[PDB]
């Protein structure tokens, strides 16, 4: 597939385990984040001693305890262990996932 | 040009007016942000009524539009925000769309 970068949020829908999630394609993030509001309560999370630094800093975010199988509509698949953060507006697909999708950025 | 998305920071070097800047390709941002530490003090700044929701800041912004030019002589205009205490300049979709950049997988 091919998606041009525009003023609109570049968006991707895929399965994480057996659930469908939609998120923002974010080459600006090293890691993937799922908003807690979207996180299935039966999926275990863990504390981390990591820091998520950007415009500000989110200390000790939770993370998926297990790796998740990500799958796209063409049945490409792989593993990611996303962070799970409250008060976020969108899920964020980070480069940890995007690199597994062999995504290129190209200008004409 | 062609750049694969990897674990390494995807990076772009270009001219803003007559100065060279290097920054992170950041499809997650609508707007472009230059770290104040890199901002030439003689380039005028203004307050904004904007709010930048992050992982929250009220940025200052370039008072004038800047000509961006890339190494292939593509060019255009952006009015970036200027924020201190940032590690990298962030090229946002305001710039990235003017460059006609595509995302593609095989």
């Amino acid at each position: 597939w091919v998606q041009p970068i525009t003023a609109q949020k570049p968006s991707l829908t895929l399965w994480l385990d057996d659930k469908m999630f939609t998120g923002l394609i974010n080459t600006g993030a090293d890691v993937t984040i799922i908003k807690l509001e979207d996180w299935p309560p039966n999926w275990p999370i863990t504390d981390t001693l990591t820091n998520l630094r950007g415009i500000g800093q989110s200390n000790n975010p939770k993370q998926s305890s297990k790796y998740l199988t990500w799958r796209d509509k063409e049945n490409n698949s792989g593993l990611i262990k996303p962070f799970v953060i409250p008060n976020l507006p969108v899920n964020l697909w980070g480069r940890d996932l995007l690199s597994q999708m062999k995504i290129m950025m190209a200008s004409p | 040009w062609v750049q694969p998305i990897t674990a390494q920071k995807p990076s772009l070097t270009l001219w803003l007016d007559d100065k060279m800047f290097t920054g992170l390709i950041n499809t997650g941002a609508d707007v472009t942000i230059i770290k104040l530490e890199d901002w030439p003090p003689n380039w005028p700044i203004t307050d904004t009524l904007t709010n930048l929701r992050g992982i929250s800041n009220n940025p200052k912004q370039s008072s004038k539009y800047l000509t961006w030019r890339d190494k292939e002589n593509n060019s255009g205009l952006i009015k970036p925000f200027v924020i201190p205490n940032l590690p990298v300049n962030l090229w946002g979709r305001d710039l990235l769309s003017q460059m006609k950049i595509m995302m593609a997988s095989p």
């Binding site: 949020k9 923002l24 974010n26 080459t27 600006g28 993030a29 090293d30 890691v31 984040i33 990591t50 998520l52 630094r53 950007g54 415009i55 989110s58 976020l88 507006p89 969108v90 964020l92 980070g94 | 920071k9 992170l24 390709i25 950041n26 997650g28 941002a29 609508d30 707007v31 930048l52 929701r53 992050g54 992982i55 590690p87 990298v88 962030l90 946002g92």
Partner: peptide, 7 residues
Amino acid sequence: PYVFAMT
């Protein structure tokens, strides 16, 4: 890790 969403 670094995270840049600024809707």
